[PDB]
Short mmCIF file of all heavy atoms in Angstrom, two decimals:
data_model
loop_
_atom_site.label_atom_id
_atom_site.label_comp_id
_atom_site.label_asym_id
_atom_site.label_seq_id
_atom_site.Cartn_x
_atom_site.Cartn_y
_atom_site.Cartn_z
N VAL A 1 0.80 -1.21 0.00
CA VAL A 1 0.00 0.00 0.00
C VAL A 1 0.84 1.27 0.00
O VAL A 1 0.44 2.28 -0.58
CB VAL A 1 -0.92 0.04 1.22
CG1 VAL A 1 -1.79 1.27 1.17
CG2 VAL A 1 -1.75 -1.22 1.26
N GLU A 2 2.00 1.22 0.65
CA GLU A 2 2.88 2.38 0.72
C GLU A 2 3.56 2.67 -0.62
O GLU A 2 3.52 3.80 -1.11
CB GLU A 2 3.94 2.21 1.82
CG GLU A 2 3.37 2.07 3.22
CD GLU A 2 4.35 2.49 4.31
OE1 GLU A 2 5.52 2.03 4.28
OE2 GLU A 2 3.95 3.27 5.20
N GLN A 3 4.18 1.66 -1.22
CA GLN A 3 4.85 1.86 -2.49
C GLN A 3 3.97 2.60 -3.48
O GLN A 3 4.31 3.69 -3.93
CB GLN A 3 5.29 0.52 -3.07
CG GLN A 3 6.77 0.43 -3.32
CD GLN A 3 7.29 -1.00 -3.27
OE1 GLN A 3 8.50 -1.24 -3.35
NE2 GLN A 3 6.38 -1.97 -3.13
N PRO A 4 2.80 2.04 -3.82
CA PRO A 4 1.95 2.76 -4.78
C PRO A 4 1.58 4.16 -4.28
O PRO A 4 1.47 5.10 -5.08
CB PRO A 4 0.74 1.85 -4.92
CG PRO A 4 0.62 1.27 -3.57
CD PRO A 4 2.05 0.92 -3.22
N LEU A 5 1.40 4.30 -2.97
CA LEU A 5 1.06 5.61 -2.41
C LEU A 5 2.23 6.57 -2.65
O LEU A 5 2.07 7.58 -3.33
CB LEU A 5 0.75 5.50 -0.91
CG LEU A 5 0.48 6.84 -0.20
CD1 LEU A 5 -0.81 7.47 -0.71
CD2 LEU A 5 0.43 6.63 1.29
N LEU A 6 3.39 6.25 -2.11
CA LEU A 6 4.57 7.08 -2.29
C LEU A 6 4.71 7.44 -3.77
O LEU A 6 4.78 8.61 -4.12
CB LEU A 6 5.81 6.34 -1.81
CG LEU A 6 5.83 6.02 -0.30
CD1 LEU A 6 6.98 5.08 0.02
CD2 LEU A 6 5.94 7.31 0.50
N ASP A 7 4.74 6.42 -4.61
CA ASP A 7 4.85 6.58 -6.06
C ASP A 7 3.84 7.58 -6.63
O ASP A 7 4.21 8.49 -7.38
CB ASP A 7 4.63 5.22 -6.73
CG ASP A 7 4.96 5.23 -8.21
OD1 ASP A 7 4.09 5.61 -9.03
OD2 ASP A 7 6.09 4.86 -8.56
N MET A 8 2.57 7.40 -6.29
CA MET A 8 1.52 8.29 -6.77
C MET A 8 1.70 9.73 -6.30
O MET A 8 1.53 10.67 -7.07
CB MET A 8 0.15 7.80 -6.31
CG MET A 8 -0.34 6.55 -7.03
SD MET A 8 -0.52 6.81 -8.81
CE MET A 8 -1.97 7.91 -8.86
N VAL A 9 2.03 9.90 -5.02
CA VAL A 9 2.22 11.23 -4.45
C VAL A 9 3.43 11.93 -5.03
O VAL A 9 3.38 13.12 -5.37
CB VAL A 9 2.38 11.17 -2.93
CG1 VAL A 9 2.87 12.50 -2.41
CG2 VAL A 9 1.05 10.81 -2.31
N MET A 10 4.52 11.18 -5.15
CA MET A 10 5.77 11.71 -5.68
C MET A 10 5.57 12.16 -7.11
O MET A 10 6.06 13.21 -7.52
CB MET A 10 6.85 10.64 -5.60
CG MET A 10 8.21 11.19 -5.23
SD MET A 10 8.06 12.30 -3.82
CE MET A 10 7.44 11.20 -2.64
N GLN A 11 4.85 11.37 -7.88
CA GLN A 11 4.62 11.74 -9.25
C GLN A 11 3.69 12.94 -9.28
O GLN A 11 3.88 13.86 -10.07
CB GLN A 11 4.00 10.57 -10.01
CG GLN A 11 3.71 10.87 -11.46
CD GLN A 11 3.28 9.62 -12.21
OE1 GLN A 11 4.07 8.69 -12.39
NE2 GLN A 11 2.02 9.59 -12.64
N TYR A 12 2.71 12.96 -8.38
CA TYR A 12 1.75 14.06 -8.32
C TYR A 12 2.42 15.42 -8.05
O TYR A 12 2.07 16.41 -8.68
CB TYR A 12 0.71 13.78 -7.22
CG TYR A 12 -0.46 14.75 -7.17
CD1 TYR A 12 -1.45 14.74 -8.14
CD2 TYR A 12 -0.56 15.70 -6.15
CE1 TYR A 12 -2.52 15.64 -8.10
CE2 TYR A 12 -1.62 16.62 -6.10
CZ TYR A 12 -2.59 16.58 -7.08
OH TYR A 12 -3.63 17.48 -7.04
N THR A 13 3.37 15.45 -7.12
CA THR A 13 4.09 16.67 -6.77
C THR A 13 5.37 16.82 -7.57
O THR A 13 6.25 17.61 -7.22
CB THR A 13 4.52 16.65 -5.32
OG1 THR A 13 5.57 15.69 -5.16
CG2 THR A 13 3.36 16.28 -4.44
N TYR A 14 5.49 16.04 -8.63
CA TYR A 14 6.66 16.09 -9.49
C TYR A 14 7.96 16.07 -8.70
O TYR A 14 8.87 16.86 -8.96
CB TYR A 14 6.60 17.35 -10.35
CG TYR A 14 7.38 17.21 -11.63
CD1 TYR A 14 6.78 16.70 -12.77
CD2 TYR A 14 8.72 17.59 -11.69
CE1 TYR A 14 7.49 16.57 -13.95
CE2 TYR A 14 9.45 17.46 -12.86
CZ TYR A 14 8.83 16.95 -13.99
OH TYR A 14 9.54 16.84 -15.17
N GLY A 15 8.06 15.18 -7.72
CA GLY A 15 9.28 15.08 -6.94
C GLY A 15 9.46 16.13 -5.86
O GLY A 15 10.47 16.11 -5.16
N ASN A 16 8.52 17.05 -5.73
CA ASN A 16 8.64 18.06 -4.69
C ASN A 16 8.30 17.40 -3.37
O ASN A 16 7.15 17.37 -2.95
CB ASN A 16 7.69 19.23 -4.98
CG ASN A 16 7.84 20.38 -3.98
OD1 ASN A 16 7.54 21.53 -4.30
ND2 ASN A 16 8.29 20.07 -2.77
N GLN A 17 9.32 16.84 -2.72
CA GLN A 17 9.11 16.16 -1.44
C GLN A 17 8.46 17.03 -0.37
O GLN A 17 7.77 16.53 0.52
CB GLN A 17 10.43 15.60 -0.92
CG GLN A 17 10.92 14.38 -1.69
CD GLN A 17 12.16 13.77 -1.06
OE1 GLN A 17 12.29 13.72 0.16
NE2 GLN A 17 13.08 13.29 -1.89
N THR A 18 8.67 18.34 -0.44
CA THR A 18 8.09 19.24 0.55
C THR A 18 6.56 19.16 0.46
O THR A 18 5.89 18.89 1.46
CB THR A 18 8.59 20.70 0.33
OG1 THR A 18 10.02 20.71 0.25
CG2 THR A 18 8.16 21.60 1.48
N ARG A 19 6.03 19.37 -0.75
CA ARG A 19 4.59 19.31 -1.02
C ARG A 19 4.05 17.90 -0.72
O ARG A 19 2.96 17.73 -0.18
CB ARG A 19 4.31 19.62 -2.50
CG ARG A 19 4.74 21.00 -2.99
CD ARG A 19 3.57 21.97 -3.10
NE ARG A 19 2.47 21.47 -3.92
CZ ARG A 19 2.59 21.05 -5.18
NH1 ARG A 19 3.77 21.08 -5.79
NH2 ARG A 19 1.52 20.60 -5.82
N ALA A 20 4.82 16.90 -1.12
CA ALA A 20 4.46 15.51 -0.90
C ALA A 20 4.22 15.24 0.59
O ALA A 20 3.14 14.82 1.00
CB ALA A 20 5.55 14.59 -1.45
N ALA A 21 5.24 15.49 1.41
CA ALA A 21 5.12 15.27 2.85
C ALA A 21 3.96 16.05 3.44
O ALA A 21 3.24 15.55 4.30
CB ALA A 21 6.42 15.64 3.54
N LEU A 22 3.78 17.29 3.00
CA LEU A 22 2.69 18.09 3.53
C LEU A 22 1.41 17.40 3.16
O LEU A 22 0.55 17.18 4.00
CB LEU A 22 2.72 19.51 2.93
CG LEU A 22 3.73 20.51 3.51
CD1 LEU A 22 3.72 21.80 2.69
CD2 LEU A 22 3.38 20.82 4.97
N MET A 23 1.30 17.05 1.90
CA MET A 23 0.10 16.39 1.40
C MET A 23 -0.20 15.09 2.17
O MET A 23 -1.35 14.82 2.51
CB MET A 23 0.27 16.09 -0.09
CG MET A 23 -1.00 15.77 -0.82
SD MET A 23 -0.66 15.57 -2.55
CE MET A 23 -2.30 15.10 -3.19
N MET A 24 0.82 14.30 2.46
CA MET A 24 0.60 13.07 3.17
C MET A 24 0.32 13.25 4.64
O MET A 24 -0.41 12.46 5.24
CB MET A 24 1.79 12.15 2.98
CG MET A 24 1.75 11.46 1.66
SD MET A 24 3.07 10.33 1.55
CE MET A 24 4.09 11.18 0.45
N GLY A 25 0.91 14.29 5.22
CA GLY A 25 0.73 14.55 6.63
C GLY A 25 1.87 13.93 7.42
O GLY A 25 1.71 13.53 8.58
N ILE A 26 3.03 13.83 6.79
CA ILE A 26 4.18 13.25 7.45
C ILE A 26 5.37 14.19 7.30
O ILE A 26 5.39 15.04 6.41
CB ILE A 26 4.52 11.86 6.86
CG1 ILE A 26 4.82 11.97 5.36
CG2 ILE A 26 3.35 10.92 7.09
CD1 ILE A 26 5.24 10.66 4.71
N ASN A 27 6.35 14.05 8.18
CA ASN A 27 7.52 14.91 8.12
C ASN A 27 8.42 14.47 6.97
O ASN A 27 8.29 13.35 6.46
CB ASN A 27 8.29 14.88 9.45
CG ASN A 27 8.97 13.54 9.71
OD1 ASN A 27 9.98 13.22 9.08
ND2 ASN A 27 8.43 12.77 10.65
N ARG A 28 9.32 15.36 6.56
CA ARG A 28 10.23 15.09 5.46
C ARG A 28 11.03 13.81 5.72
O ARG A 28 11.24 13.00 4.80
CB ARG A 28 11.17 16.29 5.25
CG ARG A 28 11.75 16.41 3.84
CD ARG A 28 12.81 17.51 3.76
NE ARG A 28 13.31 17.71 2.39
CZ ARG A 28 12.69 18.41 1.45
NH1 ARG A 28 11.53 19.01 1.73
NH2 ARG A 28 13.22 18.53 0.24
N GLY A 29 11.46 13.62 6.96
CA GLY A 29 12.24 12.44 7.32
C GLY A 29 11.52 11.14 7.03
O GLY A 29 12.05 10.26 6.32
N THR A 30 10.31 11.00 7.57
CA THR A 30 9.49 9.82 7.37
C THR A 30 9.35 9.52 5.87
O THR A 30 9.46 8.37 5.44
CB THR A 30 8.08 10.03 7.96
OG1 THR A 30 8.19 10.52 9.30
CG2 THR A 30 7.31 8.71 7.98
N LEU A 31 9.11 10.57 5.09
CA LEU A 31 8.96 10.45 3.64
C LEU A 31 10.25 9.92 3.00
O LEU A 31 10.21 9.06 2.12
CB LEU A 31 8.60 11.80 3.01
CG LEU A 31 8.49 11.87 1.48
CD1 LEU A 31 7.38 10.96 0.99
CD2 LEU A 31 8.22 13.30 1.05
N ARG A 32 11.39 10.44 3.45
CA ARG A 32 12.69 10.02 2.93
C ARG A 32 12.93 8.58 3.36
O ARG A 32 13.42 7.75 2.58
CB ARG A 32 13.80 10.93 3.47
CG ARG A 32 13.69 12.40 3.06
CD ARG A 32 14.31 12.67 1.70
NE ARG A 32 15.74 12.39 1.69
CZ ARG A 32 16.53 12.51 0.63
NH1 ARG A 32 16.04 12.90 -0.53
NH2 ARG A 32 17.82 12.22 0.73
N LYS A 33 12.57 8.29 4.61
CA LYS A 33 12.73 6.96 5.19
C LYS A 33 11.98 5.94 4.34
O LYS A 33 12.56 4.96 3.88
CB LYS A 33 12.18 6.93 6.62
CG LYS A 33 12.45 5.63 7.38
CD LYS A 33 11.28 5.25 8.30
CE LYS A 33 10.05 4.83 7.49
NZ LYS A 33 8.89 4.40 8.31
N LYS A 34 10.69 6.19 4.13
CA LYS A 34 9.84 5.29 3.35
C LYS A 34 10.29 5.17 1.90
O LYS A 34 10.45 4.06 1.38
CB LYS A 34 8.39 5.77 3.38
CG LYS A 34 7.80 5.90 4.76
CD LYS A 34 6.42 5.27 4.81
CE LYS A 34 5.77 5.50 6.16
NZ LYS A 34 5.42 6.94 6.32
#
């Protein structure tokens, strides 16, 4: 469930991890970790 999620979000924000993490509701670290 995470892989497709990460993948979808990352593609959605065009790699902008800042927007991605905000969108997911997780800190930048957790996002990098996953």
Side-chain angles (χ1 to χ4, degrees):
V1 183
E2 298 204 311
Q3 238 153 186
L5 176 67
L6 296 170
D7 190 275
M8 287 299 289
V9 167
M10 218 47 61
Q11 180 172 293
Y12 188 72
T13 71
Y14 205 88
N16 184 155
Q17 287 186 38
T18 308
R19 299 259 306 304
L22 281 173
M23 196 176 177
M24 280 184 253
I26 60 176
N27 70 73
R28 205 187 183 81
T30 310
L31 176 62
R32 298 275 298 178
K33 188 216 69 178
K34 303 226 185 69

